[PDB]
């Protein structure tokens, strides 16, 4: 008798989703284990509403574990979930971008096992995609938004290790506290083509707005953004130049039910491996922890048995920090109609792209000279021109 619940906030896709996911584990099972399910949903959510629900549900049906889903991309709700799971020593696995927004992780006492790409894993693809068309990573502009220290350090090490190319020149940061043209002063001091930035969504609107005034939104420039920038939405804000490169997890063609079914299997199979190995009973807490938490502390957790899960044709093994080593990264662009369109896929450490050479289409209108980017034809001949195979 395993327990599970799903939550949906400000969504209109839950009612049928719960029933379809309900019949899933019955056949997906390959072990004569047991499964019980329940579903719920709520409107615009707050920490107080979140915390009240979890023990109300836990005290009701003696919850073995829960799966979480929310949206709107709030940094706060990320730090809200984890510390709840920390004290109650219950395995909680939340699966969606709002929950999957990256965090610096907490003490090993917690059992959260986040479901998304790491900062290092995300960045290394961003640096690698440069090796395709645009040569040198030119500029890095960042605010004081958390997580910058790990980012600028990782890229600096990997650029000074490989000898090939990669002549990074200028890296700058801006103080939002001085919200005036003083930022434009520091911003005006970089001249190059490809600009890489790492900031929050709200500041992204302002900084790109300032650049359009000076002219960095021109036809000759390329902007590269990580996943967290506007990834978890379908309604793009204004001031974003038409034409943008991001590597995100949004998984255009995937379904939450598909993700939930995989998540459910991670719960049951891993616990099945530990329980059957040593006749282990997953002793539940008598309530949410006021006093009765201590006797269950000596009981061994599922961490030795939850790191490795199989089936569904994907090595879903986690790590110490809770980021997968076989994620489903995709790269996506802003088309002419302000509607995001998939471009290429990342799988088994390769850059498969539907585009061979860059499309080079314009920014937001009323600014389009477009008189550059010449094409050249050449013949292989005597030492004027020589051809060779790629090393």
């Amino acid at each position, epitope marked *: 008798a395993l327990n599970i619940a799903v939550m949906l906030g400000h969504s209109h896709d839950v009612t049928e989703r719960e029933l379809r996911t309900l019949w899933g584990p019955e056949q997906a099972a390959g072990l004569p284990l047991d499964v019980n399910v329940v579903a719920l949903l709520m409107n615009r959510t707050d920490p107080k509403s979140l915390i009240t629900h979890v023990c109300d549900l836990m005290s009701g049906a003696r919850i073995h574990g829960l799966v979480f889903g929310d949206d709107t991309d709030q940094e706060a709700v990320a730090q809200m979930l984890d510390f709840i799971s920390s004290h109650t020593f219950v395995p909680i696995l939340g699966i969606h971008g709002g929950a999957s927004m990256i965090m610096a992780d907490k003490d090993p006492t917690s059992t959260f096992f986040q479901f998304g790409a790491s900062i290092q894993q995300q960045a290394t693809v961003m640096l690698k995609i440069m090796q395709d068309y645009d040569w040198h990573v030119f500029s890095l502009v960042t605010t004081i938004f958390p997580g910058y220290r790990e980012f600028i350090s990782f890229v600096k090490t990997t650029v000074d290790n490989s000898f090939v190319g990669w002549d990074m020149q200028n890296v700058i940061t801006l103080d939002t506290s001085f919200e005036d043209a003083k930022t434009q002063v520091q911003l005006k001091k970089i001249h190059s083509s490809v600009i890489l930035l790492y900031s929050s969504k709200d500041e992204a609107v302002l900084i790109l707005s300032e650049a359009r005034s000076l002219g960095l939104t021109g036809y000759d420039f390329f902007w590269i953004v990580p996943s967290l920038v506007s990834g978890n939405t379908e309604l793009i804000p204004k001031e974003f130049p038409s034409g943008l490169i991001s590597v995100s997890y949004d998984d255009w063609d995937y379904s939450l039910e598909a993700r939930v079914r995989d998540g459910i299997g991670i719960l049951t199979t891993a616990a099945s491996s530990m329980l059957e190995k040593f006749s282990y009973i997953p002793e539940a807490k008598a309530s949410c922890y006021g006093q009765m938490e201590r006797p269950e502390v000596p009981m061994h957790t599922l961490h030795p048995f939850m790191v490795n899960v199989t089936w569904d044709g994907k090595d879903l093994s986690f790590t110490e920090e809770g980021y997968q080593v076989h994620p489903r990264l995709v790269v996506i662009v802003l*088309n002419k109609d302000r509607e995001w369109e998939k471009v290429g896929k990342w799988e088994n450490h390769t850059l498969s792209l539907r585009h*061979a050479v860059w*499309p*080079r*289409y*314009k920014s937001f209108s009323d600014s389009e000279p*477009d008189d550059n980017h010449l094409s050249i034809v050449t013949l292989e001949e005597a030492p004027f021109v020589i051809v060779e195979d790629i090393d």
Partner: nanobody
Amino acid sequence: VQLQESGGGLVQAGGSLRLSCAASAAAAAAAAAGWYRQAPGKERAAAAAAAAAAAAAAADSVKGRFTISRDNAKNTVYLQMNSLKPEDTAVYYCAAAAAAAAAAAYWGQGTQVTVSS
């Protein structure tokens, strides 16, 4: 990618027509669009072209009879042809090249234009 040509028919000499070729794609800014003609007994021949920059080249053979135009907003290139002569009887084709891709020569089903008395 796939295109589609249309606009043909029968028109008396000295008349006019409006041929059109269209294709679906999100990058439609950057494609060379060319018109090809191939009559019975003759090799395929170029007629009119449009560049990515926005320049127009017209073949000297039948220069001045027709004109080319491209709409950046809507993915369709249509060819406005005027002062028809019997020498123009053929099946006109539309094509694109470059901005990615491979196996680069793209040909529609074909539209036959007939000029006669």
